[PDB]
Structure formats: C-alpha cells, structure tokens
Amino acid sequence: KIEEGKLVIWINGDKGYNGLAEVGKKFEKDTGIKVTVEHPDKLEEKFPQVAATGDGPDIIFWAHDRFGGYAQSGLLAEITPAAAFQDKLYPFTWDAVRYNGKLIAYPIAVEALSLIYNKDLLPNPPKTWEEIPALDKELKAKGKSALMFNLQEPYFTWPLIAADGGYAFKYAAGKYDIKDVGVDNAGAKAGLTFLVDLIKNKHMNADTDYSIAEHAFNHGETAMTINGPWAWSNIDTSAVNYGVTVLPTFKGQPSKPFVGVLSAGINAASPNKELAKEFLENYLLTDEGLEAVNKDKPLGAVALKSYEEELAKDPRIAATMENAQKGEIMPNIPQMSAFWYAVRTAVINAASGRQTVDEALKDAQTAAAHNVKFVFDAVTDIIIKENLKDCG
Ligand SMILES: OC[C@H]1O[C@H](O[C@H]2[C@H](O)[C@@H](O)[C@@H](O)O[C@@H]2CO)[C@H](O)[C@@H](O)[C@@H]1O
C-alpha cells in the first residue's frame, strides 16, 4: 500500500542511502513531508513485483537499463520537467531515460566500472588482462592475490566478455535488433574463456561475491578489484592507498563496461507524484542534494552540469569516464532483463564448471534472443483460498 502524504524511496544498498536520507530530512523541514529511504535486497526485481499490483515505493532508484521494462509494464509515471530544468542536466542523460517517446525517470549520474588497484602491492597495474595470471603467481608466492571482484553479477564480467567483440543486442541506425544477440560470438567466447581460465587456474574463486571481493581488497589481501564509484568510500576508510584506472585490455582491445545512468523513477501508482517531482527536481538534483548523496557514496559523473564541473576534476571520475567512453550505454529495452538473466546464468555455470564456456554461451544466446521473455503481471501475486476473504 502506497501511503499518501509521505515519500518512500528505494535505492540499492551499495549507494548513498544515508546521504539521500539527509536530503529527505531537508525536504521534511521545508514541507513537513516525511521521506523514508529504504534499500531492499533484489531491488530491481522487487520493485516491478510489487509495483505491478499498485504498491511499492514512490520513487525507485536504479540504473536506467531496467526502466524500459518498468515503463512497458505501466509502472512509471511520465515525467515532464520544464525545459529550463532539463537544460541543467547533460542532454544525453535524458535520452537514457526516454522510452517510447516519454521521459520515464530523472537521470542522476553516469556509472562505469573501473580497475581499482592497491598502489603499495601493485604500483604499475596491468595494462592487459593477459598479464594478470603471471601477476597473481608472483603475488601468490608472497601470500597475496592479484584480483578479486564480484563474480555473481554479470555486470562485472561483461567488460571482459565485450572487449573482443561480445555484445548484447546488435544495433544500427537508431534501432536494436533484439533477436541478434552477441554473447556467443568468438569475442564473447574468448572473454568468458579467459575469465573461466582465471578461475580454473586458481587465480580467482567462482564463489567470490561483492562482499568477499570488497573485504579482500580493503584489507590488503588482493591487489586489484573491479567496482564502481560507490565503492570508493569504503576504500577511503581503509588503510589502502588505491588508484582508479582504465580496465585492462583483452586481445589488444579495451574492456567495454556497460554504462549505467543511475535514475530516479516515480511509481505510476504513487499518490505523491507532485511531492516526488518537487523532491527530485528541487532538492536532490541540486548541488547541495547531490553533494549530500555523493559524500556518503560517490555517484560517479553526475548528470547535473553545475556539480559535474566540480567532480570532473577528480582523477577517479576521469578514469570512470575513460572506461565509460570505451564501453556502451546500456539499452533500456525490456529485453535487457532476459539478457542479464542469460549472461548471469552463463557466467555462473561456466565459472562453477557445470557447463563449458561454449555450452554456457550457446545457451545464453538462445535464452536472451528466443527462450526467455519476462512479463510482469498482477495475477502472479494472487493466492487463491477457499474463502474469497483469504485470497490475495
Ligand atoms: O549484474 C547485472 C546487473 O547489472 C547492472 O546492475 C548494476 C547496477 O547498474 C549498479 O548500479 C550497481 O548496483 O551494480 C549492479 C550490479 O550488481 C544492471 O543495472 C542490472 O539491471 C543488471 O541486473
């Protein structure tokens, strides 16, 4: 049930929800409207689940790739900022939140993965992925390891899969061909094979997740990790002297991270749309609002021109944008959910050894193109009981 007269905001648990809450407190000081920020697990799947029945948060934060699927499902209010407000954000960010001719979210910040390295353990980080096995062996001889990053989310392995030619959906001349999936071509195979070989050769562990990799890097056990700007705050707190730099190349080609625009959508079922717009435009998307969030966990390259002009001087933001330029902006099309599901399965199954790389990526190509298609529907949530009073 969406309560009228307050704002409930959902944002992922790796981002600056405490900073966002401080913007919420200022909003409440000025308007009397309470703002509650939450960071539920599996947020990108929980939101459409509950929003399809007319429930959930007033405002949902996620990278823009999920938002077309939400908008297709009728879950997002159309936003209509004044032209003067839109001009305060970089024009391309509005295109990341445009779906079937409608703006369906407010852009917040540009996210790209970078290579993060411990300068004391590895002052000259590898320019190539191919160098990493030898670096790990040298570090293993001294009780350390070269690289740990989250192997549970395909977001983190995609830059390497895409480096030598892997792609999600083919596009040209303003349109994707969503039946032309590029996760099983030679470049995709070569990239995932390199990753799986790192695991088979004991340079990484298939079970490593976000927390395990973060703990190992921030405690100086591994020389490198792969992560986004939000992760820098926890490293700042640690004793690690780190750099943020370009991802290693593979087969002479840049790693190509999928670039996300962290975006704020308004639940189409929210009875607080006017307050949500006021909060997002006049409190969050200001220098002071973004500062509060960014101070908690860095946002990346923010969409708000006035504040990005400050942040762009940070060499970590420069590295973020160098990696971003070498990658691709994620599609926001609904089939992105099938793509991510397919690649997640393939990476997990190839890394664990349940399938070979070639078997896993053959399945992933057919899954993303033909054999997976998610449709949200309020019926999926109904439970029938003998008495109609106990149904729901
Ligand atoms: O791993 C697949 C996952 O990738 C992206 O999710 C990112 C998100 O964009 C970042 O903001 C951060 O939270 O890390 C996530 C990966 O754990 C896509 O946005 C998402 O749709 C996709 O499932």
Give the CATH number, domain containing residue 36: 3.40.190.10
Q: Both 11 and 31 in a single domain?
A: yes
Q: Of all protein residues, whose CA lies closest to atom 6 belonging to ligand 1?
A: 155
Residue in the structure block whose two tokens are 């670039």: 259
Q: Both 150 and 234 in a single domain?
A: yes
H or E element that contains 181: strand 175-182
CA 146 to each of CA 104, 111, 143, 172, 292: distance values in angstroms, whole numbers, following the listed order = 41, 24, 10, 38, 34
Q: Of all protein residues, whose CA lies closest to atom 7 belonging to ligand 1?
A: 155
Q: Of all protein residues, whose CA lies closest to atom 8 belonging to ligand 1?
A: 63
Is 30 within the bounds of a domain?
yes
Q: Please, how many CA atoms are within 13 Å of residue 274, restricted to the half-sphere of its CB?
A: 5
CA 194 to each of CA 135, 312, 347: distance values in angstroms, whole numbers, following the listed order = 15, 33, 12
Give me 30's structure tokens.
């000025």
Is 77 within the bounds of a domain?
yes
Q: Both 237 and 263 in a single domain?
A: no
Q: Both 251 and 263 in a single domain?
A: no
Partners of 115 in beta bridges: 226, 245
Give me 340's structure tokens.
């991510």
The CB of 44 under 6 Å from ligand 1? The reply is yes
Is 320 within the bounds of a domain?
no
CA 168 to each of CA 299, 321, 327: distance values in angstroms, whole numbers, following the listed order = 25, 21, 12
Partners of 128 in beta bridges: 249
Cα 382 to Cα 49: distance, rounded to the nearest angstrom = 12
The DSSP output letter for 246 is: P
Resolution in A: 1.8
Return the amino acid letter for 95: D
Q: Of all protein residues, whose CA lies closest to atom 15 belonging to ligand 1?
A: 155
- For this PDB entry, the determination method is X-ray
Q: Please, how many CA atoms are within 13 Å of residue 137, restricted to the half-sphere of its CB?
A: 6
Q: Both 19 and 55 in a single domain?
A: yes
The CB of 278 under 6 Å from ligand 1? The reply is no
The CB of 14 under 6 Å from ligand 1? The reply is yes
The CB of 58 under 6 Å from ligand 1? The reply is no
Pocket test for ligand 1, best of 155, 226, 299, 328 (most atoms within 8 A of CB): 155
Q: Both 76 and 182 in a single domain?
A: no
Return the amino acid letter for 160: L
Q: Both 343 and 201 in a single domain?
A: yes
Cα 327 to Cα 279: distance, rounded to the nearest angstrom = 32
Is 379 within the bounds of a domain?
no
Q: Both 163 and 224 in a single domain?
A: yes
Q: Is 41 exposed, middle or buried (0-12, 13-18, 19+ CB in 10 A)?
A: exposed
The CB of 66 under 6 Å from ligand 1? The reply is yes
Pocket test for ligand 1, best of 66, 149, 150, 153 (most atoms within 8 A of CB): 153
Is 324 within the bounds of a domain?
no
Cα 264 to Cα 66: distance, rounded to the nearest angstrom = 11
Q: Both 104 and 186 in a single domain?
A: no
Partners of 342 in beta bridges: none
Among the atoms of ligand 1, which is closest to the Cα of residue 111? 11
Number of domains in the chain: 2
H or E element that contains 147: strand 145-147
The CB of 111 under 6 Å from ligand 1? The reply is yes
CA of 155 to the centre of ligand 1 (A): 6
Among the atoms of ligand 1, which is closest to the Cα of residue 155? 1
Give the residue from 52, 47, 42, 44 showing the smallest Cα distance to 8: 47
Is 232 within the bounds of a domain?
yes
Phi/psi class of residue 174: alpha, beta or left (left: φ > 0; alpha: ψ in -120 to 50)?
A: left
Domain interval for residue 130: 114-256+332-371
Partners of 99 in beta bridges: 102
Is 325 within the bounds of a domain?
no
Q: Both 251 and 264 in a single domain?
A: no
Residue spans of alpha helices (H) in the chain: 17-31, 43-51, 67-72, 83-86, 91-96, 132-140, 154-163, 186-200, 210-218, 232-237, 273-279, 287-296, 305-311, 315-326, 336-352, 357-366
Q: Of all protein residues, whose CA lies closest to atom 22 belonging to ligand 1?
A: 340
Is 387 within the bounds of a domain?
no
Q: Both 179 and 40 in a single domain?
A: no
Q: Both 198 and 336 in a single domain?
A: yes
